[PDB]
Design a protein around this ligand. Structure first.
Ligand SMILES: Cc1ncc(COP(=O)(O)O)c(/C=N/N[C@@](C)(Cc2ccc(O)c(O)c2)C(=O)O)c1O
Ligand SMILES: Cc1ncc(COP(=O)(O)O)c(/C=N/N[C@@](C)(Cc2ccc(O)c(O)c2)C(=O)O)c1O
Lengths: 466, 466
């Protein structure tokens, strides 16, 4: 294919993309295909000779689309949002055309330089402490990671190297392996499974801190764990505090946990994968208070800030703490800030989104989602057959039918079966709970109301049947 | 920005992209900007209100482009190729529009299913042993990794878990940490630095095996290392064999190393990042002989098979050996095959590239690059002031002016300073060598001839001046 054919097909593809997202309400959110559906529908071998673009697009529609779960449908209320915005898509187009691999500064100066500035822009939007900004002369700075899962692992490895060096300074005989046996990392019992993965890869013990009645990590529970573990001769080296847990979008208490990590010289990583986007709005920024105690802070623009995956945003206060694991002001060498060596020009996506929405546009997006969340909450609160199971702060409502877990499992099954909307459950303290997450860029009140009416109607049939 | 504006700007962007790649010969390959050039040219803060798309595109041209190294210029002869093809760009567009995160089967069946099939397609094109194919009932299979650097780490972690379990089976009291102290990994002295990073992250010793006169790892040198290390009480657990080293595109001898790894129960990972694309051509497939002994095999379509970054292709014989690190036939759960949990629909890029080029088109691309490589070799061989420093097999020629390293350092400086072409050096056994790598999709004979005439003319001035 040459530039001239690309001019034609590229424009066709633009129309296909826009048609897909514009017409997405008409698609069934969750597929009816069984596991294994695809292989028998396409050839066992790559073609010797080219297929036409037309044949491929037909296959997209007839073979791929039936096996797609439509994340961007208004009726997708599962997990947390993933980002989809046209500015991000435009940037990704340009990103691919430039097509540099920014494993060094010389491989494309702008690929590195734009990223540092975008991380400063975003740092300032979040009102991060200045310690996290690169600027002209900062020791800190930010980096795009592929994902929060990777960010957490990066932070864990930096923390591991750091505590190892601290110990080996005092006892030069000590091997990495002897240190590893003693190390212990902590996270909330509501922490994302990415934390456990990081612990497994990092070769360290990971212990869960019991959350309080609001599913938050607190000083007292951390302190208790630390005392027990220190007395057994273990060395706490890393804590992940989660702002916006997956289960119920609860918030670890950084103001309590931060001082403890400072006094014990424990690396404090803040995972705000979802919730972090909200901190660009002043009315939510209080939830990030205490981040000044963190060694590293991460959230995903690719969840809730309209920057298409992959784009996870991580900042550190001390670049040498980070870069030491992998060996001020201007960053030339992002390869020491992340697991891979290669990277693409992902910062274009941030620049386009930030410039095309503006801060105000992004704030309006967040606030609309939170309003819709509360609109759904209001429905649930006014129905005495249901209960809300946790405080609603952002775009997630946890709710259930009053009654047994079985009733709620049956309700979920009926919702899934009806194929109008897609939701997933969680367990909160052994209890089965339905999650309603505001996801789509295009969700409106009307969608939420119809989702609720749909849920309420199924619940009514279920309750009569009992 | 809504669908309607995207239809307009998306098409503008398509034209911008095509203009960039079509006109790319007119760009200076390597930029003149100094580190830190960008920050003063753009604002310190995100805008409150939207900027226009026009202003953004102006900035791309006037501020970004001066800091871009043009990987896709015909006159870029640095490193190894990175992939740029219009079919891959079309797929990436669609990938972003669908916008699923394929962290589970239910998150989008096709996102997982298409990938397994494309890895089988690619496996068949490379004539991999059947042990590596998923098919209907295979224990093995393939996965897209973000990069070869990540693939190598994934393999190392799987290898680490496997040997750890073996050692704990004999000695159940042994901690992960006590095992780590004993473990030793090996790679060629020409192995890519990704291997050392994998060893560092994985917490294990990495030792270099001395390469032979053709910069190849051989049985005798491996065996000697193993015997020495075993007698010191170390436990070999992982070997990376490199097909297509960065320095001089040399090839480790898999037929020799494979049996040794089998007999010693050492995990054998094959890194064919660059060279692996050539193995779809029968005349190069012999270089992969012995891969039947490998536990894992990896190469980058995002180097030399026209699948834009990110797309690294990894296969294993035994999915449970891989899966066990992160805890037949149909794969539903790629999250146990890679470090991140999240992933996008990257397999679209493979499908589009393979379908729009066909196997024959891909073969023709590889063969044309290899012919151009030999054309450059032929120029060097006819000029008695120069020498070729290693066997030319694929798209890389190592060459130097006969004389001192300093003369060749000066020649490189003159080339870089003239800003017509971009090349990088290496050291081969302490000797300074220039590398000429065929990179751009659009390189032709004429570009290679002009590059050589340019190089020869600089050398002439340098030699007269001495
Ligand atoms: C609190 C918390 N911490 C870390 C992570 C890992 O983030 P990742 O590695 O994916 O960037 C998650 C992840 N959320 N996982 C979802 C909500 C699925 C999901 C949805 C949208 C996405 O854009 C996405 O990447 C993943 C889940 O259901 O687990 C997290 O919530
Ligand atoms: C033998 C060998 N093994 C592993 C890797 C890691 O590959 P990655 O992690 O990037 O996928 C490389 C990498 N090569 N690096 C280049 C040639 C630069 C380069 C050029 C084009 C790219 O598409 C790319 O990703 C990287 C170098 O000069 O180091 C490798 O050569």
């Amino acid at each position: 294919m040459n530039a001239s054919d690309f001019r034609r097909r590229g424009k066709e593809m633009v129309d296909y993309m826009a048609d897909y997202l514009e017409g997405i309400e008409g698609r069934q959110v969750y597929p009816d295909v069984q596991p294994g559906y695809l292989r028998p529908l396409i050839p066992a071998t790559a073609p010797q000779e080219p297929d036409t673009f037309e044949d491929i697009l037909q296959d997209v529609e007839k073979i791929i689309m039936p096996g797609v779960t439509h994340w961007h449908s208004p009726y997708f209320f599962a997990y947390f949002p993933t980002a989809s915005s046209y500015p991000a898509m435009l940037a990704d187009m340009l990103c691919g055309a430039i097509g540099c691999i920014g494993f060094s500064w010389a491989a494309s100066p702008a690929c590195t330089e734009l990223e540092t500035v975008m991380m400063d822009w975003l740092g300032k939007m979040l009102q991060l402490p200045e310690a996290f900004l690169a600027g002209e002369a900062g020791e800190g700075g930010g980096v795009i990671q592929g994902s929060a899962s990777e960010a957490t692992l990066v932070a864990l490895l930096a923390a591991r190297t750091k505590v190892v060096r601290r110990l080996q300074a005092a006892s030069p005989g000590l091997t990495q392996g002897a240190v590893l046996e003693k190390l212990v990392a902590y996270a909330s019992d509501q922490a994302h499974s990415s934390v456990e993965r990081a612990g497994l890869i990092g070769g360290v013990k990971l212990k869960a801190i019991p959350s309080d009645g609001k599913f938050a990590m607190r000083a007292s529970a951390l302190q208790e764990a630390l005392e027990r573990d220190k007395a057994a001769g273990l060395i706490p080296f890393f804590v992940v505090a989660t702002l916006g847990t997956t289960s119920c979008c609860s918030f670890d208490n950084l103001l309590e946990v931060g001082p403890i990590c400072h006094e014990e010289d424990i690396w404090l990583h803040v995972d705000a994968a979802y919730a972090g986007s909200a901190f660009i709005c002043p009315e939510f920024r209080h939830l990030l208070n205490g981040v000044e105690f963190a060694d590293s802070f991460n959230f995903n623009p690719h969840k809730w800030l309209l920057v298409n995956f992959d784009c996870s945003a991580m900042w550190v206060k001390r670049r040498t703490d980070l870069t030491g694991a992998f060996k001020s002001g201007l960053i030339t060498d992002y390869r020491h800030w992340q697991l891979p060596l290669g990277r693409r020009f992902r910062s274009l996506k941030m620049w386009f989104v930030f410039r095309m929405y503006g801060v105000k546009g992004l704030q309006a997006y967040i606030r609309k989602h939170v309003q819709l969340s509360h609109e759904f909450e209001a429905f649930v609160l006014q129905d005495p057959r249901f209960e809300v199971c946790a405080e609603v702060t952002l775009g997630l409502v946890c709710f259930r039918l009053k009654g047994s877990d079985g009733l709620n499992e049956a309700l979920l099954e009926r919702i899934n079966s009806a194929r109008k909307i897609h939701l997933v459950p969680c367990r909160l303290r052994g209890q089965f709970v339905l999650r309603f997450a505001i996801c789509s860029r295009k969700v409106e009140s009307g969608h939420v109301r119809l989702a609720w009416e749909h849920i309420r109607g199924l619940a009514a049939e279920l309750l009569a049947a009992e």
